[PDB]
Write a protein that binds this ligand. Structure first.
Ligand SMILES: CCOC(=O)[C@@H](C)c1cccc(C(=O)c2ccccc2)c1
Ligand SMILES: CCOC(=O)[C@@H](C)c1cccc(C(=O)c2ccccc2)c1
Ligand SMILES: CCOC(=O)[C@@H](C)c1cccc(C(=O)c2ccccc2)c1
Lengths: 387, 387, 387
């Protein structure tokens, strides 16, 4: 039975998601694919050809992969202190939950940024000692502010632990994008275009819409908390269009970020995921060598009893590598997977995975902010069960 | 020599405080007293007779003393669960710095409120997992909100540790004032009037100015942070009149709190401090029996090597009793004192102490919010050096 | 692209290294090789044919390999107490950072020497409880002193931990060379010649220059700290010829050491590295059996959270075996590698590796003391990326 269709259709029929697309490839070619629902429930327009999604933190594996290419090319290395490229990050301080502030005892490195061990936090982090000051500064909300300028504001705030000593999912991929710009003298969006998107023919992926993109953009549903104040409990899961404020412009030619902000399509993201099986384009051009791809995918952050968590949500059986999650214990996993399955996901419920043991990739595209329902993992589980 | 005058005149002559009054009594009679500076630097009006000060958390020993009287009279007991008097405090939750929320595993008691071990926080607590939600609710800022209603809003928010398991200086004295009202059916300001202020002849003490009070109210100086966002470093110490917003009304007949909000005078507060040497009025009427006064003053919360801290500011060598600080190790103390010295202080730099070994009481009144200079401790040390 | 050339040329063009040679072999034959820069910037003489390098601690894997040959031949064993061969090492003492001295509670063994777990330190060790006494004794500086005589002076000084209980990179390979002499009745340089260099046709490797060697010796650049006092921060990385004092003679026929002092060439060192893939010469003569080579290469010292460090510089993902470093966690590694990659390096920035998973060896020869730039690891990473 087509478990993937059953999951997606049940989600649409229960009024939980407006529209869903999915594709699963094996050996670089589609084996399962489908769509359910509509572009938007207001007009019930069908999902268009080459529909466009805000992929939020599925931007991070792309920007991280770019960083690995630059490491391979000698621009910087994992151990490089970021203050060597932007001195505004010299002399960081660390704050704790008891109001105590002290100088950081270790320099932030490229590796710390890629592993979320740098001590940064995030505006929406509930209970965080510093996230109120991120929100006051509007680091995420003010999407119109140039990346270079956002970093200057961020650099003045304290970290929430000494670099290297803990893990916390964070704005550090945005720092990484900025440090890439400092190190190369180029803009991160131009680098992504030349080094990744153009070689993989990802012609619909970028920080602004294509000229014909407005009619292809999927509507985004959900509730963003008033003033950005982190919610103490989930809002009701209701299909109401979300207000993104100025956080996610569609046609700002200077908007670029490391941790979110890309628009993409199912087809484009599958080209990226399939490349991660080998480090090569389908024509055989190498984007990253096998040795550095192995360095990027090896489990690098290991977690204690409570496991990997983001705002206390678990990622059971997962460790962290330089690009995102990686399954390191199927016996601890909460849904079907295989050892070494890796990938990431975004807050509008987009999700992808790469499963080297099956030469398999998969991606689910939808637009629902802060879903109470783990559609991405449900679709991965369905696809795993259908092999 | 008169070190007390020297300290006070130096502070005034360095443009650090506008006006200061102090008195030190021994055996219930004044032994040192003085005044320095002016009511306000704008007009340089002289400090009036019976000048009036916002005493902020010097409200807490008074409200705590009232609670001990009510315990003595059988209204409730230290072990009483506060949910027995207001069921809005049933089913509390606890939040941590990792965004994890769970049910409280102990009920909040009267003793927890008096010792700041209930798990409540404070709006201005820097780095606190929940203070951002206090600020969003304007618990402290909205002084026009009735105490009973402010408590309903607070009760819906999580604690930051399980009741009884830690110490954190907090809004719990306001909860105590509210629970007093629940338990007695009377208002806390009326109970304070009948049980404490009138027997001690504290005719100028209350939550609103006396009829002839506006001309005697000292000006308040200092910088309250924008939006109440807790500052990451001290603001420059400058004598600029402070803007209190709607947090501290002068003529609201329903304004009443437990942790702040009283107006008082040097002479009134000394009457209260002298009473704490015996539990008796000067006429010999008992406000609190010797046994319950001993219960209230005995060291009750003991601190680790980090010591007692508020927003990471230390109270070196102090433990906590049911009314405030108490000196338990002169060899750890950071300024002159004796074993058993007790008292408290307020954010506008008012300060008092009681020293049973010398039958001594002292009080410094001034108005500077968030002083970088610990005038209260400096004046205590001067008085200790003189006796 | 030729990443190796790009790295080397960038280092020369940025005035960071005078001259660099490299070679990478696979299956015993060169696959990548090159050179950049000059022998010396003063005259800009090109790097000569068979250029000679001071290889410093790349002496250690050679002397360690010699020790394994002697273990195989029954001269001594890993568990042999060194005091059995030189009684000046009976009755060692241990000093700590609190000035406390006590007798060592374990005897130093051959294995302790090969693993730097014997408790010795090094003259240049910053912050070390005993390195000031090494410097006073001029153990490293006085290169004219006979090895046998240096050992007598060293033997009178305390260790910095009990043998076997910790790891600290040390003068212990020099102790090993001396104990080899005691055990065999032969000089270490004669043993190296007969057992290793002559079988591998390493005709330019030794503790003094060949008769035609003076014109082939690469100039050495960098700053040695005045009086040998360990620096608190890196000196500026500037190409100024280094003053080696009497630490590294070119034509002393009795100069021999275990931890440094060899002159070699790229070609000679690659013959040694290639032999470590098999324990055999290219003609198939066995220098060390497969079983004892496996014993020598197996990870033997494992490190805690802070990892393997020398003067606080990290070797991320590396453990220690009887010959040097060995990669035991690619997920912790700071630059491209494979599980089981091993080798060592020297303070003038020479570096080599052996990668059994690729049947690969590599060596970078240059002369810069105390480089701020990890040229050896950069070149390894480049070569790994080019496979
Ligand atoms: C996957 C990428 O998520 C992010 O990193 C940032 C960019 C982000 C940006 C804008 C809006 C949100 C939320 O709507 C939200 C966050 C937390 C809880 C509920 C909703 C999150
Ligand atoms: C001593 C009693 O002050 C308190 O602890 C609480 C009751 C309180 C209540 C109302 C206003 C403020 C401030 O204005 C303020 C707090 C922190 C920094 C600067 C200003 C504080
Ligand atoms: C790899 C072999 O390093 C050694 O074991 C010893 C022989 C050594 C001998 C002579 C000079 C130096 C330094 O120049 C130096 C040491 C520490 C920091 C900066 C410079 C080191």
């Amino acid at each position: 039975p087509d478990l993937l269709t059953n999951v997606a259709e049940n989600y649409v029929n229960q009024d939980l998601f407006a529209g869903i697309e999915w594709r699963i490839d094996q050996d670089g070619k589609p084996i399962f694919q489908g769509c359910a629902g509509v572009k938007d429930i207001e007009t019930r327009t069908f999902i268009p050809k080459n529909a466009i999604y805000r992929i939020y933190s599925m931007t991070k594996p792309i920007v991280s992969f770019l960083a690995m290419m630059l490491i391979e090319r000698g621009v910087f290395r994992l151990s490089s202190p970021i203050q060597n490229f932007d001195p505004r990050f010299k002399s960081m301080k660390v704050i704790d939950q008891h109001a105590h502030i002290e100088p950081a005892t270790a320099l932030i490195t490229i590796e710390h940024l890629l592993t979320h061990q740098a001590g940064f936090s995030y505006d929406f982090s509930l209970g965080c000692p510093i996230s109120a000051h991120y929100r006051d500064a509007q680091l995420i909300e003010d999407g119109g502010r140039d990346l270079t300028d956002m970093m200057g504001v961020l650099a003045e705030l304290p970290l929430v632990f000494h670099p290297g000593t803990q893990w916390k999912y964070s704005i550090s991929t945005d720092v990484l994008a900025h440090i890439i710009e400092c190190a190369t003298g180029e803009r991160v969006d131009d680098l992504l275009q030349r080094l990744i998107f153009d070689p993989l023919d990802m012609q619909d992926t970028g920080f602004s819409l294509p000229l014909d993109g407005a009619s292809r953009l999927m509507e985004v549903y959900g509730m963003r908390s008033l003033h950005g104040l982190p919610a103490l409990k989930p809002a009701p899961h209701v299909l109401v269009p979300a207000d993104l404020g100025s956080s996610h412009p569609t046609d700002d030619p200077d908007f670029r970020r490391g941790g979110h902000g890309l628009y993409s399509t199912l087809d484009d993201y599958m080209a990226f995921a399939n490349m991660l099986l080998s480090g090569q384009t389908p024509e055989g051009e190498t984007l990253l060598s096998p040795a550095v791809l192995k360095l990027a995918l090896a489990p690098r952050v290991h977690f204690g009893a409570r496991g990997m968590r983001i705002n206390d949500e678990p990622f059971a059986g997962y460790s962290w590598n330089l690009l995102g999650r990686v399954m390191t214990d199927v016996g601890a996993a909460a849904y079907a997977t295989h050892l070494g399955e890796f990938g990431w996901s975004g807050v509008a419920a987009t999700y992808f995975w790469v499963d080297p043991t099956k030469n398999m990739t998969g991606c689910v595209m939808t637009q629902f902010l802060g879903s109470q329902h783990p559609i991405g993992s449900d679709m991965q589980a369905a696809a795993m069960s259908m092999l």
